[PDB]
Design a protein around this ligand. Structure first.
Ligand SMILES: Cc1nnc(C(=O)NC(C)(C)c2nc(C(=O)NCc3ccc(F)cc3)c(O)c(=O)n2C)o1
Ligand SMILES: [Mn+2]
Ligand SMILES: [Mn+2]
Length: 200
C-alpha cells in the first residue's frame, strides 16, 4: 500500500534477520500467540480484536459499535486472553512453556500500563516493524481469508457478526491456522532478500 522509506526498510530487514537467525538456531513457531484488530462493518462498525496460534483462535472480542481499543482496554484484553490461554492450551497452564507474543506496535500495544502487564505475564514480545502487515500473520493470513468471505455479507446486527465469526473460525481446519503461522520463515527470508522492501 505504502511507500517505505529508508528507516522503514532498514527496520524491516533488521527485524527479519534477527527472527530468521533465531529460527534457524531453534524453531519457536509453535510457541507464538499472535493477534490484531480489524473493523467489521454492519447495517456502523464493530472492532474485532482476535488472538490465535497454530491450533486456532484462542480468544476474541467484538467491541460495541464505534468503540476503540485504548490503553486500558488492551490491558484488560491481555488479562482476559491469558485466562483463555490457560483454559485452552495446557502446555501453558503447566508452565512447561513460555508464550511468545507477536503484535504490532499500535500505541495502545506499547503504552506503559500494557508494557507492565506483558512484563508481569512474562510473555516474550517479538519485534515487529512498522508498516509490515506482510509480516503479521493476522493480516497476511487470517484477515486476508476473512476479507474475501466478508465481502458477500450484509450484517443486520452485532449479533449476526458474532455468529458469523464463531462459525467461520470454527469451520477452518487446524491445518489453516498451522500454515498461517508456519509461513513466517519464508516471509522473513523474502523480506531479507528484498533488503526490507515489500515483496511478492
Ligand atoms: C507503523 C504504522 N503506521 N501506520 C501503519 C500501518 O501499517 N497502517 C496500515 C493501515 C497499513 C495498517 N495498520 C495497522 C495498524 O495496526 N496500524 C496502527 C499502527 C500505527 C503506527 C504503528 F507504529 C503501528 C501500528 C494494521 O493492523 C494493518 O493491517 N494495516 C493494514 O503502520
Ligand atoms: Mn493492527
Ligand atoms: Mn492489521
Amino acid at each position: 500500500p505504502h511507500e517505505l522509506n529508508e528507516r522503514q526498510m532498514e527496520r524491516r530487514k533488521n527485524t527479519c534477520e534477527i527472527l530468521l537467525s533465531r529460527y534457524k538456531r531453534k524453531s519457536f513457531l509453535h510457541r507464538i500467540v499472535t493477534g490484531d484488530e480489524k473493523w467489521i462493518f454492519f447495517v456502523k462498525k464493530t472492532m474485532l480484536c482476535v488472538w490465535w496460534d497454530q491450533s486456532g483462535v484462542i480468544y476474541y472480542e467484538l467491541l460495541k459499535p464505534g468503540e476503540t481499543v485504548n490503553a486500558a482496554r488492551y490491558q484488560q484484553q491481555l488479562i482476559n486472553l491469558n485466562r483463555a490461554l490457560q483454559r485452552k492450551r495446557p502446555e501453558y497452564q503447566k508452565r512447561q512453556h513460555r508464550v511468545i507474543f507477536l503484535h504490532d506496535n499500535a500505541p495502545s500495544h506499547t503504552a506503559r500500563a500494557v508494557r507492565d502487564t506483558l512484563e508481569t505475564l512474562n510473555w516474550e514480545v517479538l519485534p515487529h516493524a512498522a508498516y509490515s502487515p506482510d509480516l503479521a500473520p493476522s493480516d497476511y493470513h487470517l484477515f486476508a481469508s476473512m476479507g474475501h468471505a466478508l465481502a458477500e455479507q450484509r450484517f443486520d446486527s452485532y449479533e449476526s457478526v458474532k455468529k458469523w465469526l464463531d462459525e467461520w473460525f470454527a469451520a477452518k481446519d487446524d491445518e489453516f491456522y498451522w500454515r498461517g503461522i508456519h509461513k513466517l520463515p519464508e516471509r522473513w527470508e523474502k523480506c531479507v532478500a528484498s533488503d526490507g522492501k515489500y515483496f511478492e
